[PDB]
Amino acid sequence: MESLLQHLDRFSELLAVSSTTYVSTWDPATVRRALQWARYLRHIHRRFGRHGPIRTALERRLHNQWRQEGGFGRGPVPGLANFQALGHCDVLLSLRLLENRALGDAARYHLVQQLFPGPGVRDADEETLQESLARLARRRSAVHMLRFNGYRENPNLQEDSLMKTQAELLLERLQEVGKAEAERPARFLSSLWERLPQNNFLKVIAVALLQPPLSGEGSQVLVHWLLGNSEVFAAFCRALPAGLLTLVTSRHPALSPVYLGLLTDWGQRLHYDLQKGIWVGTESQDVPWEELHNRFQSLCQAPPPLKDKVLTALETCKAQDGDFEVPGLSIWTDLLLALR
Amino acid sequence: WVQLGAQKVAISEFSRCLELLFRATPEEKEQGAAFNCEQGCKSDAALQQLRAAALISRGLEWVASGQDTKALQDFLLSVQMCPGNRDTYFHLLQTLKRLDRRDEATALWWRLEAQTLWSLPLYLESYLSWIRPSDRDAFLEE
Ligand SMILES: [Zn+2]
């Protein structure tokens, strides 16, 4: 049990330095030692990797490693990301050494000769490293070929295949932080928000809010994070399309009263011009009539639990601004007229 | 309805008039389908004077209700529409003298003196003579 800690952390240090350009002192001995250690970890993962204290100990070690590093400053080093990557650690190491230009000639030769010995060893009991890399090359080729011959960006994002993949990764990555309980998930998400591209991230959150559970604590965390952070939710509802927000809001009733409140504030900063029969905003970043109509139409074309909510929120905002029944006076009368 | 004291339904009717005035053309002489008014219910002068009339009659109700910004929008639009009636300018400048006197007022004074009846219908002539205030020129030389 304790024997595996010094094995795994040492291997992780060796792995992390694998990608780094200090390779001068390396030799066949170092490479042989690396790959036999990696075989040992891949053997552990097979033997007693499931349903024991050892699995959870290794997960504690891995996730504690990935949060003590954090991903700030001195190095945004990946590391082996999770316990499943224990079963293919050797492949990571080999790939990193093949990408390191700074590798020495004899090390390179010994490496590649140990990865790809040839068909001298066509008969093997354990799925070896050569087969693993071949299967990887096939998959990478398959992915390229499907992406550029048959794939289409589906408009119903929740049914897309990229967004669904990113989403499942995010959910798994939140589950591990939850089990760790070291730092709160909201801090990870806030750091992500600064770090990576916002437009992409928001579509991904939207999509992860709708994937059914597989262990919905993941979605349960993101709703709390969003309701806590108003600024992101201002761009959440603003950037995405209509039906996605509608399905999100119908799935999570806690997002409904704020969303209508966001829309209710965007109408109020419009002004009607008599010459062109169109509501418009003063500032350029004020939502147009067409987009706002689309949002309310999607909300009305929804389950009954939300239809009455939006309808009452519109009537109460109409009567608040004079209970007119004629256009040119109230954006809310004009909405309710256009819905029918 | 104004003379009977009903702000809401008054503004309703003025808004209905305005919608029909901007979202439709009376001078649709594409298809000669009937008997029609040759002169009275075609004149662009009648159209602009009538636009202005309805804008003013709406703005005065906004003033009564305490919505001077909307009133300003209507009066400004009437000035943009018919710059040679001066009832527009009187109402607009009274509002600007209430809210933000100096610069905008003089900016429109200069417009008036840059500017300085043909064949209108009588229902429009008489409507304007009814709504206009007696203290127009007295206020406009102030
Ligand atoms: Zn006529």
From Swiss-Prot, chain A:
Organism, scientific name: Homo sapiens (Human)
Function noted in UniProt: DNA repair protein that may operate in a postreplication repair or a cell cycle checkpoint function. May be implicated in interstrand DNA cross-link repair and in the maintenance of normal chromosome stability.
Swiss-Prot/TrEMBL keywords: DNA damage, DNA repair, Fanconi anemia, Nucleus
Name the record gives this protein: Fanconi anemia group F protein
InterPro entries listed in its UniProt record: FANCF (IPR035428), FANCF_C_sf (IPR038505)
Recorded consequence of changing Y272A: Strongly reduced monoubiquitination of FANCD2
Signal sequence bounds: none
Phenotype upon changing L209R: Reduced monoubiquitination of FANCD2
Transmembrane segments: none
Gene: FANCF
GO cellular component, one term: chromatin
Alphabetical GO biological process terms: DNA damage response; interstrand cross-link repair
Subcellular location(s) per record: Nucleus
One Pfam family matching this protein: FANCF
Domain of life (superkingdom): Eukaryota
Oligomeric and partner information: Belongs to the multisubunit FA complex composed of FANCA, FANCB, FANCC, FANCE, FANCF, FANCG, FANCL/PHF9 and FANCM. The complex is not found in FA patients. In complex with FANCA, FANCG and FANCL, but not with FANCC, nor FANCE, interacts with HES1; this interaction may be essential for the stability and nuclear localization of FA core complex proteins.
Pathological association: Fanconi anemia complementation group F: A disorder affecting all bone marrow elements and resulting in anemia, leukopenia and thrombopenia. It is associated with cardiac, renal and limb malformations, dermal pigmentary changes, and a predisposition to the development of malignancies. At the cellular level it is associated with hypersensitivity to DNA-damaging agents, chromosomal instability (increased chromosome breakage) and defective DNA repair.
UniProtKB/Swiss-Prot annotation, chain B:
Places the protein is found: Nucleus; Cytoplasm
Signal peptide bounds: none
Tissue specificity field: Highly expressed in testis and thymus. Found in lymphoblasts.
UniProt repeat feature TPR, residue ranges: 1-24, 52-85
Subunit (UniProt): Belongs to the multisubunit FA complex composed of FANCA, FANCB, FANCC, FANCE, FANCF, FANCG, FANCL/PHF9 and FANCM. The complex is not found in FA patients. In complex with FANCF, FANCA and FANCL, but not with FANCC, nor FANCE, interacts with HES1; this interaction may be essential for the stability and nuclear localization of FA core complex proteins. The complex with FANCC and FANCG may also include EIF2AK2 and HSP70.
Function: DNA repair protein that may operate in a postreplication repair or a cell cycle checkpoint function. May be implicated in interstrand DNA cross-link repair and in the maintenance of normal chromosome stability. Candidate tumor suppressor gene.
Protein name: Fanconi anemia group G protein
Organism: Homo sapiens (Human)
Gene this chain is encoded by: FANCG
Residues of the full protein shown: 463 to 611 of 622
